[PDB]
Design a protein around this ligand. Structure first.
Ligand SMILES: *[C@@H]1O[C@H](CO)[C@@H](O[C@@H]2O[C@H](CO)[C@@H](O)[C@H](O)[C@H]2NC(C)=O)[C@H](O)[C@H]1NC(C)=O
Ligand SMILES: *[C@@H]1O[C@H](CO)[C@@H](O[C@@H]2O[C@H](CO)[C@@H](O)[C@H](O)[C@H]2NC(C)=O)[C@H](O)[C@H]1NC(C)=O
Ligand SMILES: *[C@@H]1O[C@H](CO)[C@@H](O[C@@H]2O[C@H](CO)[C@@H](O)[C@H](O)[C@H]2NC(C)=O)[C@H](O)[C@H]1NC(C)=O
Ligand SMILES: *[C@@H]1O[C@H](CO)[C@@H](O)[C@H](O)[C@H]1NC(C)=O
Ligand SMILES: *[C@@H]1O[C@H](CO)[C@@H](O)[C@H](O)[C@H]1NC(C)=O
Ligand SMILES: *[C@@H]1O[C@H](CO)[C@@H](O)[C@H](O)[C@H]1NC(C)=O
Ligand SMILES: *[C@@H]1O[C@H](CO)[C@@H](O)[C@H](O)[C@H]1NC(C)=O
Ligand SMILES: *[C@@H]1O[C@H](CO)[C@@H](O)[C@H](O)[C@H]1NC(C)=O
Ligand SMILES: *[C@@H]1O[C@H](CO)[C@@H](O)[C@H](O)[C@H]1NC(C)=O
Lengths: 421, 162, 196
């Protein structure tokens, strides 16, 4: 869309309202751990073919060590992200957080595999050892991964984020958000005077999350691509066991049954050379693909230690807006964050001035903007409209009214003088 | 015996990559199935030669009826006794099971840490009264060895006609 | 282990390369010198090419892993170049980026093919239970704290910083007034000292 900001010197725009937003972010942490024994493709349980394979040095030893290396690594990708809490915190049995709901993120007192009401959708919106193929089971089962996320959730919604410093320190959630207003340059009095409105706005944002996930065609496409590439790079590998590669036949048992040793060693060696090259290629691609997820499981670990275990000033990483907090949710092969941010709205423009000329001395605001609605000047914080009368208590004097350009003559109220009189 | 229904004009059957699942008996005209006897890797769990010369062999993903016996999701254990209590993981077997040496070799579902839950009330806070300064190390690799292999000499090795 | 492991893989993928020189690759001998002279050139060229393709294809392999493993080092060599800038040459507010605690400073120290950081942090300890309140209604007006918490030992109310217990009497220079004590849910009546 086309925009044109009404820019003009001495004119500013200051918001008068805010809208809580919750935007999901999806990151893949690990992929499937498949281990392939190189001897069972090339030979396929044939003693007379194994001897021909050992003539090729130690190729079959590297292709077993390489895949094992990118299988132990997948148990470190999960460890870095979730296993970041020494203890396992729990929510109190009586949930009174001042209005905030959290019933869609907390574990379910229901059917087993105690996931949240949202994690149930994530584990349902995404939904073998035949010839040398294996699929090793992950060290961390989904029943315990869902308990790291519960432990992180059971502490972030009840004790701030003093976890990043050591001991857990209790603090009511109604006074957590007051702290994190001060992080983004908003006075904490905005929360308390708008607590009921803010709680309803936050609750509605969460309610639209599962609606935006289940109803939409595919929001988990990032996690589906990893599955659609592993399962497809394996079909292409398996389907290469039915190619002649220049031999009489593509099945090894039917060559030894109609050929003598001295002339069958040349037909086998065409399959051995072809199949070995048809296995080195896929192992190489897995090494590249594993590094892609390795760099993605290191970013998901950073987001867990910054957006979840604290408040981040980094722009457009923990959500699009002014970050407040995040809630981690498990996934079949990844992790989902729910960034909570403020988006200013309902802005109105006014006329400004860099300084106030009173008593022949320049005045500058401490934390605020000199703002005028047309006749009277006020001081407001830069992120929310709250006008206050200019006073010596919220302004400081430094300079003279002949250097800076743009001063407006106005009186600075002094509170001691009328009390003295 | 093959439960899958066939047709009489032809005999063999396969699904993917020339893997014949079923076959028709010539003499008896009976349709059978073909699945090989199960293979699988073998993993040896040891607590170190210095501590003891003991091992807990694990057979990867086998039903254990075709090989202190114990059956896991990863496979079957031979040499480890299941224990109710949960300890921190020492040797990761897989599928949420770990083993350690402490009355010889145990196999337990690992615990996720010291469970705790401090009190939380809507009008109480906890503020620290003191501090402890700690120094923690952190190690990062920066470089490798700068090897350089010339392709000509390695392949040929002093042979003009090669 | 991080530094020692990198040494092993370099010395393991290179020892494996050396041992590949004594493999037949389907030829008649693993020594090239004994095939040149024992066989005629017309039939040696078809057996030598078995070694050439075998050795060349076994040389393209380790170059690829060295190329792949190099990217694993540059990725880890950019964290050090970032941790050195953001944490040694300054103070970082990124949580858990340079230690377990509130960052104070770090010192860089060399290591063979690596670097070691000594992150000095600030870990709070010895917490104490307290009773708090969002604001305080004095003369009908709310009084939120400029910076700190309205803690109460049980009978009296103080203002202390959020990371260390340091109680102070509530005055007009510690709190700022805004609105009236009619909207805040949980405000507690108390008297605010006036130093004038
Ligand atoms: C914004 O500041 C000035 C003060 O008069 C006004 O200018 C308009 O600003 C809007 C964008 O905010 C533009 O779309 C108009 O073209 C501007 N000119 C007009 C309406 O004549 C405007 O009154 C102020 N905007 C608001 C909501 O108060
Ligand atoms: C704050 O922290 C220390 C613990 O690290 C408390 O204990 C003191 O520790 C130092 C060094 O071990 C000793 O020299 C002191 O004698 C200890 N003080 C005691 C036991 O009372 C310390 O008390 C705490 N408070 C202060 C003011 O330092
Ligand atoms: C909190 O616990 C007791 C109960 O109030 C405090 O003891 C009194 O505190 C006030 C001011 O703090 C003193 O003026 C009184 O002399 C104390 N005694 C009585 C009978 O009131 C104790 O001081 C408080 N703890 C701290 C660290 O201030
Ligand atoms: C929280 O959300 C659920 C979902 O609708 C709702 O049933 C409940 O009334 C809300 N409040 C509490 C205290 O659970
Ligand atoms: C094939 O030979 C056997 C042996 O007599 C017998 O079952 C029968 O003659 C034949 N089987 C058939 C027709 O199914
Ligand atoms: C092993 O076989 C028994 C009976 O066939 C079965 O109950 C059990 O589930 C099997 N375990 C597997 C397939 O892992
Ligand atoms: C171990 O746990 C099972 C049930 O979980 C129980 O039946 C059994 O008695 C326990 N045995 C010991 C030694 O604790
Ligand atoms: C603070 O009060 C709660 C209530 O039981 C308690 O669990 C906690 O241990 C107390 N903190 C200290 C340091 O005693
Ligand atoms: C806190 O909870 C109690 C009851 O659980 C309630 O009476 C009170 O209104 C709440 N707020 C404060 C400041 O006590």
């Amino acid at each position: 869309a086309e925009n044109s900001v009404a820019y003009s010197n001495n004119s500013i725009a200051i918001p008068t309202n805010f809208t809580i937003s919750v935007t999901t972010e999806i990151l893949p942490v690990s992929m499937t751990k498949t281990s392939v024994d190189c001897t069972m493709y090339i030979c396929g349980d044939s003693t007379e073919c194994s001897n021909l394979l050992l003539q090729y040095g130690s190729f079959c030893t590297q292709l077993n060590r390489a895949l094992t290396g990118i299988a132990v690594e997948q148990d470190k990708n999960t460890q870095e992200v979730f296993a970041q809490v020494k203890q396992i915190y729990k929510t109190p049995p009586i949930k009174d957080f001042g209005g905030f709901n959290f019933s869609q993120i907390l574990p379910d007192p229901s059917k087993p595999s105690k996931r949240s009401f949202i994690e149930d959708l994530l584990f349902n919106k995404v939904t073998q050892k035949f010839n040398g193929l294996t699929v090793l089971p992950p060290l961390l089962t989904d029943e315990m991964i869902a308990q790291y996320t519960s432990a992180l959730l059971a502490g972030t919604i009840t004790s701030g984020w003093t976890f990043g410093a050591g001991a857990a320190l209790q603090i009511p959630f109604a006074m957590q958000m007051a702290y994190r207003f001060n992080g983004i340059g908003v006075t904490q009095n905005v929360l308390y005077e708008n607590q009921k409105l803010i709680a309803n706005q936050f609750n509605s944002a969460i309610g639209k999350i599962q609606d935006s996930l289940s109803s939409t065609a595919s929001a988990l496409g990032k996690l589906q691509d990893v599955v659609n590439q592993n399962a497809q790079a394996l079909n292409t590998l398996v389907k290469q066991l039915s190619s002649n590669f220049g031999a009489i036949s593509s099945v090894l048992n039917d060559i030894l049954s109609r050929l003598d040793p001295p002339e069958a060693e040349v037909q086998i060696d065409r399959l051995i050379t072809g199949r070995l090259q048809s296995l080195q290629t896929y192992v190489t691609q897995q090494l590249i693909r594993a590094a892609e997820i390795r760099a993605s499981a290191n970013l998901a670990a950073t987001k867990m230690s910054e957006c979840v275990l604290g408040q981040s000033k980094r722009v457009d990483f923990c959500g699009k807006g002014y970050h407040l907090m995040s809630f981690p949710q498990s996934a079949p092969h990844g992790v989902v964050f729910l960034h909570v941010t403020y988006v200013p709205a309902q802005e109105k423009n006014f006329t400004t001035a860099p300084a106030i000329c009173h008593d022949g001395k320049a005045h500058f605001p401490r934390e605020g903007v000199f703002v005028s609605n047309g006749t009277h000047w006020f001081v407001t914080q830069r992120n929310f409209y709250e006008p206050q009368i200019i006073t010596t208590d919220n302004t400081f004097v430094s300079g003279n009214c002949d250097v800076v350009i743009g001063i407006v003559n106005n009186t600075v109220y002094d509170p001691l003088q009328p009390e003295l009189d | 015996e093959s439960n899958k229904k066939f047709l009489p004009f032809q005999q063999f059957g396969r699904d993917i990559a020339d893997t014949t699942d079923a076959v028709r008996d010539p003499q008896t005209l009976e349709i059978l199935d073909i699945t090989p006897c199960s293979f699988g890797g073998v993993s040896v769990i040891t607590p170190g030669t210095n501590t003891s010369n003991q091992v807990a062999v694990l057979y990867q993903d086998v039903n254990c009826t075709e090989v202190n016996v114990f059956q896991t999701r990863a496979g079957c254990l031979i040499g480890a006794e299941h224990v109710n209590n949960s300890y921190e993981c020492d040797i990761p077997i897989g599928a949420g099971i770990c083993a350690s040496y402490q009355q010889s070799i145990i196999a337990y579902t690992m615990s996720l840490g010291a469970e705790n839950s401090v009190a939380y009330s809507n009008n109480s806070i906890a503020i620290p009264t003191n501090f402890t300064i700690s120094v923690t190390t952190e190690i990062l690799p920066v470089s490798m060895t700068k090897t350089s292999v010339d392709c000509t000499m390695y392949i040929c090795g002093d042979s003009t006609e090669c």
